[PDB]
Amino acid sequence: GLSDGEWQQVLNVWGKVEADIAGHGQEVLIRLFTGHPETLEKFDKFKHLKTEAEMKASEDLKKHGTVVLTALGGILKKKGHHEAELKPLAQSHATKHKIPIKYLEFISDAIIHVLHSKHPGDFGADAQGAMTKALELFRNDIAAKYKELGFQ
Ligand SMILES: [C-]#N
């Protein structure tokens, strides 16, 4: 678990994200796709994007950034009580989208980078540690669902 103070740090920086969810989503996906190009292959509708300029110009990529961070926001706000969300998210990422756990690690690292870049005053080491723990909790719970399904 995270402590109450850790949860408060996590949702404090998340409130900052929510002021421009779309901008944040776009930056997170760009950081992910450029840092780990294998991740881009999982998105049929983003495969044609070959440069960071092309990604930055893609309204659909920005829209999708909004979708993914909005979903994550709802999960974070459950402060670990996220079974209703995590169960179908696991099944879809394992079965429908075929997403290795390692890629969830990659996007978590991308989120940390972006939040630190944009909100350093609300994302010092302790708050970063808290966010990292929150994302690890989520990944760890999904991993259990992956194991249940026999997805590697
Ligand atoms: C999901 N992105």
From Swiss-Prot:
The entry sums up its family as follows: Belongs to the globin family.
The record's principal subcellular location, in a coarse class, is cytoplasm
Q: Where does heme b bind?
A: H93
Tell whether Acyltransferase is among the UniProt keywords.
no
Pfam families to which the protein is assigned, alphabetical: Globin (PF00042)
PTM Phosphoserine: at which residues? S3
Q: Which residues form a coiled coil?
A: none
Residues at which nitrite binds:
H64
Q: Could you say which enzyme class this protein belongs to?
A: oxidoreductase
Q: Give the catalysed reaction(s), semicolon-separated.
A: Fe(III)-heme b-[protein] + nitric oxide + H2O = Fe(II)-heme b-[protein] + nitrite + 2 H(+); H2O2 + AH2 = A + 2 H2O
Q: Per its record, what are the GO molecular function terms?
A: heme binding; metal ion binding; nitrite reductase activity; oxygen binding; oxygen carrier activity; peroxidase activity
Protein function: Monomeric heme protein which primary function is to store oxygen and facilitate its diffusion within muscle tissues. Reversibly binds oxygen through a pentacoordinated heme iron and enables its timely and efficient release as needed during periods of heightened demand. Depending on the oxidative conditions of tissues and cells, and in addition to its ability to bind oxygen, it also has a nitrite reductase activity whereby it regulates the production of bioactive nitric oxide.
Query: Which residues are noted in the entry as O2-binding?
Result: H64
Assembly and partners are described as: Monomeric.
Per UniProt, residues of the Globin domain are: 1-147
Q: Which GO terms describe its cellular component?
A: sarcoplasm
Specify the species: Equus caballus
Q: What is this protein called?
A: Myoglobin
An individual GO BP term: oxygen transport
Cell compartments where the protein resides: Cytoplasm, Sarcoplasm
**What InterPro entries does UniProt report for this protein, alphabetically?**
Globin, Globin-like_sf, Myoglobin
Keywords assigned:
Cytoplasm, Heme, Iron, Metal-binding, Muscle protein, Oxidoreductase, Oxygen transport, Phosphoprotein, Transport
- Determine if GTP-binding is one of this entry's keywords: no
